[PDB]
Amino acid sequence: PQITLWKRPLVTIKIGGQLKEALLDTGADDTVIEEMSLPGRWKPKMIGGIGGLIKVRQYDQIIIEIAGHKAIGTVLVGPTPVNIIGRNLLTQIGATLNF
Amino acid sequence: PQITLWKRPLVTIKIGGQLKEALLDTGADDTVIEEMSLPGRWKPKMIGGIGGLIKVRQYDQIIIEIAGHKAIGTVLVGPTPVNIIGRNLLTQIGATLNF
């Protein structure tokens, strides 16, 4: 699609067979999704969050659909207030900033 | 321009007659720029930062050039580690996310 920025650029994603709302964030290097049911192995990581650090599970090679576009990449799963799609996955769907 | 996201989307901005590097961030509502010389009146605000809150000066009706495109809007000036161009100014230069 072509998304203007008058409102937050929120889209529907599909991950672990579940639909969620997520923010397309060009200022984020990585993707962080709220706690959820996923199968498979993961590695513990900590990242910055509101209030301080948060504990996440790093899942590699996750299939995610972002506004109907399928992508493979790493997803950090933990207690974030906003689902964030960062550049690691925006690059996989060919997303560009245009002006 | 059309900016891909393999690297951070850093561009040159011009503000208060000074060139700076800034991150184009669709996940940011507002624009935050490092401490600098500016003329004019301002209002004190606090926002979230790395480590905790930070103190900023809110300047309204600031002219800023973003990769050669001129925009008018509000800028928060304070001790940020990264200059961030948020949606308040991305909308003014007609920026879209495209995929």
Curated annotation (Swiss-Prot), chains A, B:
Quaternary assembly: Homodimer, whose active site consists of two apposed aspartic acid residues.
Active-site residues from the entry: 25
Part of the whole protein covered: 501 to 599 of 1447
Protein name, per record: Protease
Disulfide feature: none
Chain spans, region Dimerization of protease: 1-5, 49-55, 88-99
Domain Peptidase A2: 20-89
Function, as annotated: Aspartyl protease that mediates proteolytic cleavages of Gag and Gag-Pol polyproteins during or shortly after the release of the virion from the plasma membrane. Cleavages take place as an ordered, step-wise cascade to yield mature proteins. This process is called maturation. Displays maximal activity during the budding process just prior to particle release from the cell. Also cleaves Nef and Vif, probably concomitantly with viral structural proteins on maturation of virus particles. Hydrolyzes host EIF4GI and PABP1 in order to shut off the capped cellular mRNA translation.
